[PDB]
């Protein structure tokens, strides 16, 4: 009788199930022949608006994403089971969260666009220090005369998770001493990344990267790797 | 003592215009021939229109195990009548013979479900030669290669009522 209870709620959305994956597999298979060039991109972490802007930043083309294993099945993970000529090699290079941009304009143009495409991103950098007094919404990265004091509602989030020893007397959030949050040139911890994201310090930048390309007439993987 | 397997065939005694019926047969588990025949009659009366007065047992023979010394995974399908409505039940018993499997099944049903002999119906018993098709974990665990386990807390029996050694286990 002793089993974990479920916190499920009567939401307005339900799981798509296996049907969506099967449909995407067929869509990828059809796109493999519909378009000339194929690519295996890496988009492990990107905001949805960035993807939407990418999907409309170029002429008629299809940006295809999905489950990594589903994409491998569509391409085939074995030479004997490969769907197209040497398509197994292309699947072998799919490592992370991959997506395919099916288009036929120019092989050089696509890679040039990938190289030149850069946008702001979070830390998931230069060191930052919180002001020694009242903490503002931006954590002192902008003049206090322009920013606004942090909302007291998020102080429990600061204390319990971010580890900062915040105190609330005159409940406008204040700290007893400046707090170092990030060092110079290091991969921030999950707590540090969350702290930076809350402060809105999007110092990092994201640039799309591609591992390899493919062509319907080349019959082989275009092993071009740029970031 | 142990359960016995008998092949029982009924005749449905013939009469003019009804000659030589199909000679229905059944497999019955019972301790003796009389109980086997009684169970066969009970099943036959329910299955179709026949009665002991208007029928006879063609022949009864004990079904000896083909391989009395061999471990088999017996698949069991049983219908048992509980206090509430009856329902189907599938069980697997690792045993040496069909008789032993049925004997263990009777005890298991009596214990885990309080189902008496009167309320137990043996739908079918089949030896499972395959291994990948075993579905019950408590029998599957015994199929691991080179399975070895200890017997911790061994307890001995003493004839005399008094012991001076203060014995131990293993």
């Amino acid at each position: 009788r002793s089993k974990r209870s479920k916190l499920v709620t009567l939401a307005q959305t339900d799981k798509k199930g296996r049907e969506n994956k099967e449909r995407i597999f067929d869509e990828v298979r059809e796109a493999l022949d519909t378009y000339r060039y194929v690519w295996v991109l890496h988009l492990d972490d990107v905001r949805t608006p960035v993807l939407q802007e990418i999907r409309t930043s170029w002429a008629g083309s299809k940006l295809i994403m999905g489950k990594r294993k589903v994409l491998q099945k569509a391409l085939g993970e074995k030479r004997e089971e490969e769907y197209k000529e040497n398509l197994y090699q292309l699947s072998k290079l799919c490592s992370g969260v991959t997506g395919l941009l099916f288009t036929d304009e120019d092989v050089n143009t696509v890679k040039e666009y990938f190289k030149s495409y850069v946008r702001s991103d979070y830390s998931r950098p230069l060191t930052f220090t919180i002001p020694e007094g009242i903490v503002y919404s931006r954590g002192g990265q902008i003049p206090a005369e322009e920013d606004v004091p942090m909302i007291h509602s998020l102080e429990p989030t600061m204390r319990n998770k971010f580890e900062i020893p915040t105190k609330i007397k005159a409940g406008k959030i204040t700290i007893d001493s400046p707090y170092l949050v990030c060092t110079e040139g290091e991969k921030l911890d999950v707590r540090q990344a969350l702290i930076l994201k809350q402060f809105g310090i999007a110092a990092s930048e994201f640039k799309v990267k591609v591992s390899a390309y493919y062509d319907n007439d080349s019959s082989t993987v275009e092993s071009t790797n740029i970031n | 003592a142990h359960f016995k397997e008998y092949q029982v065939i009924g005749r449905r005694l013939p009469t003019e215009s009804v000659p030589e019926p199909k000679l229905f047969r059944m497999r019955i588990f019972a301790s003796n021939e009389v109980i086997a025949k009684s169970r066969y009659w009970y099943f036959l009366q329910k299955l179709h229109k026949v009665k002991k007065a208007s029928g006879e047992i063609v022949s009864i023979n004990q079904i000896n195990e083909a391989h009395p010394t061999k471990v088999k995974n017996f698949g069991v399908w049983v219908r048992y009548d509980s206090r509430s409505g009856t329902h189907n039940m599938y069980k697997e018993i690792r045993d040496v013979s069909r008789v032993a499997a049925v004997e263990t099944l009777y005890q298991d049903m009596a214990a885990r479900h309080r189902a008496r002999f009167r309320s137990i119906h043996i739908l079918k018993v089949a030896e499972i030669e395959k291994t990948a098709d075993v579905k019950r974990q408590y029998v599957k665990q015994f199929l691991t290669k080179d399975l070895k386990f200890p017997l911790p807390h061994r307890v001995q029996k003493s004839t005399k009522t008094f012991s001076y050694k203060r014995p131990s286990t293993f």
Partner: protein
């Protein structure tokens, strides 16, 4: 289903070593030693390579499986305490009456002394358990740090410290004065 045998793997770092006899267990390492009397749990230990130890229970039920798992968890906790150590940071805040916390050698037991809790004249003495070092935080206002090798002792001391300053006959939604834990990280 009365599993024939179930076991869990205990990872012992190269630095520390553990010697096992009847269910009395000893752990030794750079940060001292710890012991526990697991004779009430009825589990079996076995050596593999002096770097991994398996605790196996034969013909054990669901309760026995849980007992084995908690034995594994306790052994892991002992190893972590012997290797890393625990640092239970505690903080106290007050509205009007400044709470005063000090360590006194009354009766030669290093009792912790708390005074002026909400203006109460009564002074509570909390006996400091064995093997739990206590030091006041530096450059951090109204913070005290409790550290020790054993998880149980440090956690019990931290719980006792906060339980002593239990508001009575007052609205907890208004009287924020009290003692609370602020961190549970390792000394390292």
């Amino acid at each position: 289903m009365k599993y024939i045998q179930t076991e869990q793997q205990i990872e012992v770092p190269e630095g520390v070593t553990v010697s096992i006899k009847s269910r009395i267990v000893k752990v030794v390492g750079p940060r001292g030693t710890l012991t526990k009397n697991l004779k009430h749990i009825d589990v079996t230990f076995t050596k593999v390579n002096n770097q991994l130890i398996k605790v196996a229970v034969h013909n054990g039920g669901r309760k026995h499986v849980a007992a084995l798992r908690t034995v594994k968890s306790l052994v892991d906790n002992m190893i972590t305490g012997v290797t890393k150590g625990y640092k239970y940071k505690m903080r106290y805040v007050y509205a009007h009456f400044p709470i005063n916390v000090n360590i006194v050698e009354k009766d030669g037991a290093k009792f912790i002394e708390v005074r002026n809790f909400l203006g109460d004249k009564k002074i509570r003495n909390v006996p400091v358990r064995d093997g739990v070092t206590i030091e006041f935080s530096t450059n951090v206002k109204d913070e005290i740090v409790l550290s020790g090798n054993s998880v149980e002792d440090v956690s019990q001391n931290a719980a006792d410290l906060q339980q002593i300053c239990r508001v009575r006959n007052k609205d907890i939604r208004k009287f924020l004065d009290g003692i609370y834990v602020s961190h549970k990280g390792f000394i390292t």
